[PDB]
Ligand binder design. Sequence first.
Ligand code: COA
Ligand code: COA
Ligand code: CL
Ligand code: CL
Lengths: 180, 180
Amino acid sequence: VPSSALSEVSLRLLCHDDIDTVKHLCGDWFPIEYPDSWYRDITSNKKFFSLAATYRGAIVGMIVAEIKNRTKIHKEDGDILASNFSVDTQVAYILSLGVVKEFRKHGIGSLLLESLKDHISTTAQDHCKAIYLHVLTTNNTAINFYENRDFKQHHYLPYYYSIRGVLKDGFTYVLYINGG
Amino acid sequence: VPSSALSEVSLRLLCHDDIDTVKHLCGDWFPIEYPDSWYRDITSNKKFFSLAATYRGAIVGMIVAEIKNRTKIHKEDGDILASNFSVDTQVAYILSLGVVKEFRKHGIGSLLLESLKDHISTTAQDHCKAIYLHVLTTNNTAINFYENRDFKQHHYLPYYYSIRGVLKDGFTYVLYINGG
Ligand SMILES: CC(C)(COP(=O)(O)OP(=O)(O)OC[C@H]1O[C@@H](n2cnc3c(N)ncnc32)[C@H](O)[C@H]1OP(=O)(O)O)[C@@H](O)C(=O)NCCC(=O)NCCS
Ligand SMILES: CC(C)(COP(=O)(O)OP(=O)(O)OC[C@H]1O[C@@H](n2cnc3c(N)ncnc32)[C@H](O)[C@H]1OP(=O)(O)O)[C@@H](O)C(=O)NCCC(=O)NCCS
Ligand SMILES: [Cl-]
Ligand SMILES: [Cl-]
């Protein structure tokens, strides 16, 4: 992969034709398998903001975000917005950010993140006061990435057990924007 | 297993010597694997009320419950107690109830449940106003068992996905006792 790969990278919305490719990439990047309907959802342009980075026609990275009002923020993360912000105030939750391994450290991840931030800072309907996400405590690469881009650790989420399943521990990271 | 097995069943607290057996039984009954310290905890008689049913010296069943004040109730189940109840008001959460397969339908499960309820209805320190538990939507056997013992469905808990893991959907079931 050429050092100049970034200059020839394009950005576009995901579409239904991408589903198989997305599944494959997500299967490579994340141990948690979401149901098939999630993949349709993010490739539909209705409920999610999903941007792909492409190189010579191939998807080499992607970011998936959900724009939420305060009532759709994870309950354990309700306090990412101070208590004086209106319920209609919105935030962007990063469901997914990934780049094909060989294409990493070329600025693609930063590009996808910047694009999400511009999207929610310039258009009225998706205007947001924060970006937040969850990261496993063991994902040092992602933690450094976000902290170097001025996301702050907002919470530690402890390990959780139930007959319904197990949630690993993790962090809630948050970036305040546009007066957030 | 004889129809009269129940008349010869004894009850006793779990102890540290039971851990290997408990682990083996829990491996058979539940798909979720809890950390080693959980097994130590439930056999330690500190944080949990854990009763075993034994037949001819062998454990054929167990119930594990946690006595909680209002602040320790699962957030999604907080509303099992009306707001007029004292903050110190207690409830019992069933973490675990299981009977060895061939000993099932002999009244052992009911005996364990009855014992839990007497423990929290007669002694002052562990006195409770409710018993609640979680059950997977697919566990018809457990749902019928509890509903036939007048537990009522309090909540549906929907499926949950995150980078931290997956929670299957399920029900919160609740039994009010002692004026609860
Ligand atoms: C986290 C992740 C998305 C970052 O993507 P990325 O494309 O590697 O991101 P970037 O290239 O913009 O930045 C990473 C690093 O490469 C550096 N970099 C960018 N261009 C570079 C270049 N031409 N030469 C040398 N380094 C470069 C960035 O400066 C550096 O980070 P730093 O500024 O904090 O020191 C990626 O490692 C990944 O896909 N992980 C697996 C999926 C995952 O863990 N997702 C969880 C949510 S992030
Ligand atoms: C749910 C469970 C704990 C019930 O244990 P159990 O010992 O079979 O419970 P019981 O024998 O007291 O009662 C069950 C049924 O057998 C019947 N039964 C009891 N004694 C009987 C007898 N001598 N002859 C015929 N039927 C009998 C009960 O009457 C009947 O219940 P019903 O009144 O609702 O019709 C058991 O199936 C189990 O271990 N499941 C796996 C673990 C699990 O799913 N746990 C969920 C909570 S974590
Ligand atoms: Cl992660
Ligand atoms: Cl269950």
